Design an enzyme around this catalytic site. Sequence first.
Site, PDB file in Angstrom:
ATOM      1  N   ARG A   1      -8.738   9.205   1.824  1.00 24.51           N
ATOM      2  CA  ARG A   1      -8.069   7.953   2.152  1.00 24.51           C
ATOM      3  C   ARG A   1      -7.496   7.934   3.558  1.00 24.51           C
ATOM      4  O   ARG A   1      -6.923   6.919   3.961  1.00 24.51           O
ATOM      5  CB  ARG A   1      -6.954   7.671   1.147  1.00 24.51           C
TER       6      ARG A   1
HETATM    7  N1  LIG Z   1     -14.667  -1.822   2.197  1.00 18.05           N
HETATM    8  C1  LIG Z   1     -14.682  -0.471   2.270  1.00 18.05           C
HETATM    9  N2  LIG Z   1     -15.393   0.174   3.215  1.00 18.05           N
HETATM   10  C2  LIG Z   1     -15.413   1.513   3.291  1.00 18.05           C
HETATM   11  N3  LIG Z   1     -14.743   2.316   2.452  1.00 18.05           N
HETATM   12  C3  LIG Z   1     -13.989   1.802   1.456  1.00 18.05           C
HETATM   13  C4  LIG Z   1     -13.917   0.346   1.308  1.00 18.05           C
HETATM   14  N4  LIG Z   1     -13.118   0.103   0.260  1.00 18.05           N
HETATM   15  C5  LIG Z   1     -12.711   1.298  -0.223  1.00 18.05           C
HETATM   16  N5  LIG Z   1     -13.230   2.308   0.487  1.00 18.05           N
HETATM   17  C6  LIG Z   1     -12.987   3.743   0.232  1.00 18.05           C
HETATM   18  O1  LIG Z   1     -12.311   3.903  -1.015  1.00 18.05           O
HETATM   19  C7  LIG Z   1     -11.183   4.759  -0.850  1.00 18.05           C
HETATM   20  C8  LIG Z   1     -10.047   4.392  -1.792  1.00 18.05           C
HETATM   21  O2  LIG Z   1      -9.821   2.988  -1.810  1.00 18.05           O
HETATM   22  P1  LIG Z   1      -8.342   2.443  -2.099  1.00 18.05           P
HETATM   23  O3  LIG Z   1      -8.050   1.347  -1.117  1.00 18.05           O
HETATM   24  O4  LIG Z   1      -7.431   3.633  -2.212  1.00 18.05           O
HETATM   25  O5  LIG Z   1      -8.517   1.791  -3.555  1.00 18.05           O
HETATM   26  P2  LIG Z   1      -7.450   1.979  -4.742  1.00 18.05           P
HETATM   27  O6  LIG Z   1      -6.205   1.310  -4.229  1.00 18.05           O
HETATM   28  O7  LIG Z   1      -8.109   1.282  -5.897  1.00 18.05           O
HETATM   29  O8  LIG Z   1      -7.302   3.463  -4.923  1.00 18.05           O
HETATM   30  C9  LIG Z   1     -10.777   4.624   0.601  1.00 18.05           C
HETATM   31  O9  LIG Z   1     -10.305   5.869   1.107  1.00 18.05           O
HETATM   32  C10 LIG Z   1     -12.050   4.240   1.310  1.00 18.05           C
HETATM   33  O10 LIG Z   1     -12.615   5.400   1.918  1.00 18.05           O
END
Ligand SMILES: Nc1ncnc2c1ncn2[C@@H]1O[C@H](COP(=O)(O)OP(=O)(O)O)[C@@H](O)[C@H]1O
Lengths: 471, 471, 478
Positions: C342
């Site tokens: 992340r």
């Molecule tokens: N649109 C996107 N493009 C590239 N990577 C993404 C995208 N959406 C999510 N990810 C990957 O998913 C990982 C976790 O997403 P996150 O925002 O933490 O979702 P959640 O809140 O459901 O855990 C991020 O570290 C990212 O690398």
Amino acid sequence: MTRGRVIQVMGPVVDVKFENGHLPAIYNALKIQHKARNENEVDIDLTLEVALHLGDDTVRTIAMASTDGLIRGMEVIDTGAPISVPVGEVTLGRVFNVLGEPIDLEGDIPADARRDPIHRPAPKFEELATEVEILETGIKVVDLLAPYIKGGKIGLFGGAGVGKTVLIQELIHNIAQEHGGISVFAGVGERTREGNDLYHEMKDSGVISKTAMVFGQMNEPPGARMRVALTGLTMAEYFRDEQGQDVLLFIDNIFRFTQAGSEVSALLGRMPSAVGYQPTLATEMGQLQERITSTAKGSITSIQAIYVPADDYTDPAPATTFSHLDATTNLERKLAEMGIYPAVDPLASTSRALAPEIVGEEHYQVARKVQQTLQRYKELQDIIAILGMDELSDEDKLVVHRARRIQFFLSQNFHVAEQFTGQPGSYVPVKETVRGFKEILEGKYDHLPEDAFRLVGRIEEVVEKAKAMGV
Amino acid sequence: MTRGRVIQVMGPVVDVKFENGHLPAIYNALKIQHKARNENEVDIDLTLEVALHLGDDTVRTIAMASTDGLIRGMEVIDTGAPISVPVGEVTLGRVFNVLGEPIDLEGDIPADARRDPIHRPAPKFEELATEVEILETGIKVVDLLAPYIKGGKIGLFGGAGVGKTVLIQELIHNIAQEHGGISVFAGVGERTREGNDLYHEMKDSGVISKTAMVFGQMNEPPGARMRVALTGLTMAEYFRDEQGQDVLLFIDNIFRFTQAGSEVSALLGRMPSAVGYQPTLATEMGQLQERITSTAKGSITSIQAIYVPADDYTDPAPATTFSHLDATTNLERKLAEMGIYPAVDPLASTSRALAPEIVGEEHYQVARKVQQTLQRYKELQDIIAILGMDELSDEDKLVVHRARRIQFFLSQNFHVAEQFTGQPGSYVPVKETVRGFKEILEGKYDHLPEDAFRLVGRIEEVVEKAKAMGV
Amino acid sequence: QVSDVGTVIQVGDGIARAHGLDNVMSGELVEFANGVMGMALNLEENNVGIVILGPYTGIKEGDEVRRTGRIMEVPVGEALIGRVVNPLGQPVDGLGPVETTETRPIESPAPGVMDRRSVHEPLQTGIKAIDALVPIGRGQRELIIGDRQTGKTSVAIDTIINQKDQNMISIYVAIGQKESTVRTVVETLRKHGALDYTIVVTASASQPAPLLFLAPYAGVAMGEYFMYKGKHVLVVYDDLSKQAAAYRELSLLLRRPPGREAYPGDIFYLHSRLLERAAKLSDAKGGGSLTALPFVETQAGDISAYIPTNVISITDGQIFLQSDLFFSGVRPAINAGLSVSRVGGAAQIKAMKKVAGTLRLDLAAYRELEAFAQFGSDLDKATQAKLARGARTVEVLKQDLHQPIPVEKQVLIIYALTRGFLDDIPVEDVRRFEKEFYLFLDQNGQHLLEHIRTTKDLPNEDDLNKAIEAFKKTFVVS
Ligand SMILES: Nc1ncnc2c1ncn2[C@@H]1O[C@H](COP(=O)(O)OP(=O)(O)O)[C@@H](O)[C@H]1O
Ligand SMILES: Nc1ncnc2c1ncn2[C@@H]1O[C@H](COP(=O)(O)OP(=O)(O)OP(=O)(O)O)[C@@H](O)[C@H]1O
Ligand SMILES: Nc1ncnc2c1ncn2[C@@H]1O[C@H](COP(=O)(O)OP(=O)(O)OP(=O)(O)O)[C@@H](O)[C@H]1O
Ligand SMILES: [Mg+2]
Ligand SMILES: [Mg+2]
Ligand SMILES: [Mg+2]
């Protein structure tokens, strides 16, 4: 004067005994302010919320902070009212905790500022608004298959690590910078690192002057995690009612409210329900959700992220949450594992705005045809994995050929995902995405390699990517 | 006086009340000796072990035998020490029960002999020894894919009727007959017929002169089934420490120990854990297992059979014992039904000793390549199940061709299994095992029928039996 | 000499009930008559519930319990470096006493929103797959999750060893492991020279459940001591599932009603409270950092279980190890589709970012395409090129145990892979290609390595291409 005393401390739940006939009402706030009598004690400044009247002049409360340090027999102050937080222009540009105290070290709120109680009943049937109007986001899959509604309720569902936070941040980026009203962000049981990142991004972009932020992140006790959402909601309700403003309300993760309730249910003394949740799950959810709504006096458009435990969409918390939403986005780690982002499920996602008389006949037909093609492709995979692709009919082969390209073209590169993708993001108008999907369905791009459709934006970018690849 | 009185009797659990200031310590042994006062009573001779202090001068105990005939008000004697069993030279060639009393009819042990408490803390961190050395067993699959470690802990897992006892007997036959140290056998919750057979076999083979045996078989009450393993361990620790010997410790079924603990825990008043097990399952297992270790003074190598209830490897009792083992062999009913013995799962079984610097570079390469081919074969099982080998690619056909022969060659004819079938057993050196599997991997014997690889031993026997049959 | 006193009512399974102790404080240390310590957890109306931090055999009903006036605390200081201690700070290595002169509360608030700064500096583990696909930065919390015997401990040990010259304190916390396994780990660290900057906190399986419950908090407090002085700390929790079991045991013994799978209600709050204390502090707070590597052991590779999902929802990414990958020959067996970081990108050197911004997405797409093409029979040129590139990438990411690789060589091999210089090399030869390429860089490419090492950016692409082509001419394909 009316003073209580602590009689029992059991983790985050504290029992206080008052004098006869002077019990505080339910949801009233209590204060413990203790100065250490000697070297074997510590100073305490703690706030409690009344939950139950146990009888025999005894009250069971939930603490808003850590209870370590408490001693049986400590004096308790009754404030005579629920938690009250400041509202108005004062809250804009500031960051608050659950109790309405600023945490951005910009100074204290004046003691004579107006403060509103946290708890109130929901708006009545008479004073609601039901007009449906499209809110454009610049995201292809959302704008095509499940459009968002101005003044409506939008929920983002997904398991752990599928992209809820990234989608929230992209929506903030695309919408809040030009909304023209007021935005409120509430962090409920999420990462302090993410909160700090969002705050600094907003401060750099300048949106912070128009936004109020409240944080109840993971490190906090269940009482704070279950009241921070109500703090943010009352801050937004002030602007909805007293000023008639349009309000954007972002909630970081609304599942943590239910989770905190379930954490304290057993200590409160209630029998467990089906999957370990509290018996009052639906009622507690409804009393909060029904307040987040548009009225005649003003409109609140809200986007909520909803966690799905263990990827099970039949779990009681998301299952109960489903009935409170107008538009829904479902994220699947089946798509996330394949490299498709934002990983929206194109079939499970629904919206009340997908009607011929709202989006237009051409848009409706294109969306329905895309869904039909994807549904047909889903059924073919089982027999493909066994009998190979050669045994399909020519119609099924064409269906697979076009469905793969459609599924890849539903991907997009986001502005807030440069750290993950290595390239800048894109914004796609709804007319452009409709035309592009119509052309793909008609077969204008059957000769293009299917990898050229990944994470691009407009349809011309697919052609440019394929030309770079040497086709 | 240190005299108690029986208050409650609930199956194997007895409550005893003492005078104020004279409660026995936890794990102390208590004696009940009652002579029938009239024709409506029976004579009683029973031993109890303290488990809890209930308050109000009341102690809750676990009985080492049946409680039938107990009456409220019976007098109880406090011995002031835990259960004590004789140790030393006197235990060699003898058979004992949980209380340290001989049951072989060879005569009682003198009352002045040295005897040690059953309960003791585990050896300190600085006393341990961590050198790794291979223990050759003569079994092909064990020597190749999961070598046993001298001075380490080895566990054998399996369901009902899969081969744990036969594998134990084969290991005893291959190793203990020439060990030259001291051997201890502990029968926990198994058949009395098996114990009688083992006693007579050892007596006939002459190994009885250097081994001691303790029996806690299925007919016994749960308290005896809980403490018999500790009795055996106490006898082994003396030889490890006071004499610096190398000790073989065989435990017939260590799962019965936790099963008896779970039977008792309900009546002690504890809240049940996940699958009805005792909440203290992990601590009890840890306290038993941490004593079984090699130190600087001497080394103890232990081979333990572990029962898997209902063939569920995710069951808490089998699951929690995995972390205590240096090498594991997992038996599978699926392999046992296909005629493959000892039916060891080649992918699930693991060992710390499988490393190039311990077993050798070519040994490591051969083992890893065998495991790779078996994994690839496992990945195809659904396709073969539905439509067979006809639609496989040429590479996968060769993978299946090699993998079936490897899987069959992992079988072996045991010395002990000569009673089930007339075929005598074989002892295969690890060099021969490595050479044979390398030759099979290289494709030398692709022309031999796959039935010629079953239950042979050395690779030359495959050629011999293929010649004996049609080829 | 005066002290508030209590008397014991119940003893058993590491739990005691005490009468009296009117002025006892919630979370306070108490000591029994024979010298064993305890912590008061439940303050009921007429009795106190105490968890015993030691051997409870010598405690009997009617004994005396004394207040200490201290909230649960552990010793901290530089004197713990190179020592093996239990959660209470008592040495267990037999090398004499520990001369700490300071202590910290075992329960302390996490740094707030305004106290933190975004993670921006990398933590090099020396493993190509981790440093390219799932980057880790200082202040990040990365979960290592997988079944038993997949390499979780090996990854952590290699990471600790690789911090030798990077000026970082390491803390290794073992919960519920065998003392022999802990001793093996300590000896490995000593042999590789990592014990000069490492603290080992151990709570073996024979210890009572409250010590296993408290061990990670003691470790994180010891880390926080150095964090708030401006240092950088690495903390490894070798199994969080084992304290989950220990906390379940304690809660059941204290008559607290259970929830799902008999776990208590606040099983999520336990781990969230623990892991929120790892952070990257802002410049006003001194700029120190603490970074954590929690471990979770799954059953049969079920990543969607209760505790694994709880932990995944907390940390900043996870590294998932699979047995099927492990046996198929790919090690350290990281599943690129199910693993994510992340903080990715911000926790990488500029050159590494340039060469590997899209590598994880490329691998996920390759896995999907490899699964799909198994069904077809006539693939086209694009699908052939993608499959070849994916296979070569998979083979490049393989690595052996205890073989650290510098980041300046990782970036060069990744550049060679991603710019197409490996397209004519057969798949079975790329590992030997990498080995001989590292030798060639050591002999003739020292200027490139020094430029990367000093600037954190790639050299000019012309010279680097010339060096690669020279090595191609030297190399012989077998
Ligand atoms: N649109 C996107 N493009 C590239 N990577 C993404 C995208 N959406 C999510 N990810 C990957 O998913 C990982 C976790 O997403 P996150 O925002 O933490 O979702 P959640 O809140 O459901 O855990 C991020 O570290 C990212 O690398
Ligand atoms: N190596 C072998 N060769 C031939 N037959 C075998 C072998 N191992 C097991 N068997 C068969 O399986 C039967 C069960 O074996 P065994 O008594 O070892 O099982 P177990 O796992 O100990 O069972 P239980 O749970 O009843 O104790 C034997 O009686 C025999 O018929
Ligand atoms: N990259 C690798 N290459 C080769 N062998 C490896 C590699 N990583 C780990 N191993 C081996 O795999 C085995 C398991 O590794 P390790 O003990 O670190 O895993 P684990 O998941 O921590 O195990 P446990 O569940 O037993 O605690 C060991 O024998 C180790 O040497
Ligand atoms: Mg999130
Ligand atoms: Mg048996
Ligand atoms: Mg491990």
